[PDB]
Curated annotation (Swiss-Prot), chain A:
Name recorded for this polypeptide: RNA polymerase II-associated factor 1 homolog
Subunit annotation: Component of the PAF1 complex, which consists of CDC73, PAF1, LEO1, CTR9, RTF1 and SKIC8. The PAF1 complex interacts with PHF5A. Interacts with POLR2A, TCEA1, SKIC3, KMT2A/MLL1, SUPT5H, RNF20 and RNF40. Interacts with UBE2E1. Interacts with PINT87aa which is encoded by the circular form of the long non-coding RNA LINC-PINT; the interaction enhances the binding of the PAF1 complex to target gene promoters and may anchor the complex on target gene promoters, sequentially pausing RNA polymerase II-induced mRNA elongation. (Microbial infection) Interacts with influenza A strain H3N2 NS1 protein; the interaction interferes with host cell gene transcription, specifically with that of antiviral genes.
Annotated family: Belongs to the PAF1 family.
Function: Component of the PAF1 complex (PAF1C) which has multiple functions during transcription by RNA polymerase II and is implicated in regulation of development and maintenance of embryonic stem cell pluripotency. PAF1C associates with RNA polymerase II through interaction with POLR2A CTD non-phosphorylated and 'Ser-2'- and 'Ser-5'-phosphorylated forms and is involved in transcriptional elongation, acting both independently and synergistically with TCEA1 and in cooperation with the DSIF complex and HTATSF1. PAF1C is required for transcription of Hox and Wnt target genes.
Protein source organism: Homo sapiens
Subcellular localization: Nucleus
Domain of life where this protein originates: Eukaryota
Disulfide bridge positions per record: none
UniProtKB/Swiss-Prot annotation, chain B:
TPR repeat residues: 39-73
Residues of the full protein shown: 3 to 131 of 1173
Localization of this protein: Nucleus speckle
Protein name, per record: RNA polymerase-associated protein CTR9 homolog
Expressing tissues: Widely expressed.
Function: Component of the PAF1 complex (PAF1C) which has multiple functions during transcription by RNA polymerase II and is implicated in regulation of development and maintenance of embryonic stem cell pluripotency. PAF1C associates with RNA polymerase II through interaction with POLR2A CTD non-phosphorylated and 'Ser-2'- and 'Ser-5'-phosphorylated forms and is involved in transcriptional elongation, acting both independently and synergistically with TCEA1 and in cooperation with the DSIF complex and HTATSF1. PAF1C is required for transcription of Hox and Wnt target genes.
Assembly information from the UniProt record: Component of the PAF1 complex, which consists of CDC73, PAF1, LEO1, CTR9, RTF1 and SKIC8. The PAF1 complex interacts with PHF5A. Interacts with KMT2A/MLL1. Interacts with STAT3. Interacts with SETD5. Interacts with ERCC6. (Microbial infection) The PAF1 complex interacts with Zika virus French Polynesia 10087PF/2013 non-structural protein 5/NS5. The interaction with viral NS5 proteins may reduce the antiviral immune response by inhibiting the recruitment of the PAF1 complex to interferon-stimulated genes, thus preventing their transcription.
Length: 48, 129
């Protein structure tokens, strides 16, 4: 048999498999907005 | 705005609280309630505190406005349900900006209990649901 190195370590690296991943944005589960009908004290629907 | 009006019992529409300074909200409860002032002003200065950049004294001074639903108001219980739906929404909102020390339930309990009294008078508000 061949005396293979135990490849317990990454030096290639997997960075081709890594930066291909586009990373989710899940900071706030309702998508980063406070959902409120009271804090719209203002409205652009008025003129103009 | 930066100073709206707080009506008196006798010779009303005379006194003002300028909101550029920050008074403590508990003495505001006093100076409102020795004057038997209408519940609408409690919402108005709550909005003043919120536009002053406050989310916590804003939401706790209104807890003192939960006592005076119809105190001398001649059926401003519509005004009390408007008061209480603000706490029923902003307790659960301030629970989402929770800190390292309290629990989410440390505000969700107060949100859920006060919502029960919010549904005692009025059902299926645009904010109840």
């Amino acid at each position: 048999t061949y005396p293979f190195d135990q490849n317990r370590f990454v030096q290639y690296k997997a960075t081709s498999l890594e930066k291909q991943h586009k990373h989710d944005l899940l900071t706030e589960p309702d998508l980063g907005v406070t959902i409120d009908l009271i804090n719209p004290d203002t409205y652009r629907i008025d003129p103009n | 705005r930066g100073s709206i009006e707080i009506p008196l019992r006798d010779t009303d529409e005379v006194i003002e609280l300028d909101f550029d300074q920050l008074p403590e909200g508990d003495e505001v409860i006093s100076i409102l309630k020795q004057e038997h002032t209408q519940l609408h002003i409690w919402i108005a200065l709550a909005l003043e505190y919120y536009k002053q950049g406050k989310t916590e004294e804003f939401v706790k001074l209104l807890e003192a406005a939960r006592i005076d639903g119809n105190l001398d108001y001649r059926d401003h219980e519509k005004d009390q349900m408007t008061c209480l739906d603000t706490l029923a929404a902003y307790y659960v909102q301030q629970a989402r900006k929770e800190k390292n020390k309290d629990n989410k339930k440390d505000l969700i309990t107060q949100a859920t209990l006060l919502y029960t009294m919010a549904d005692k008078i009025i059902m299926y508000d645009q904010n109840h649901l």
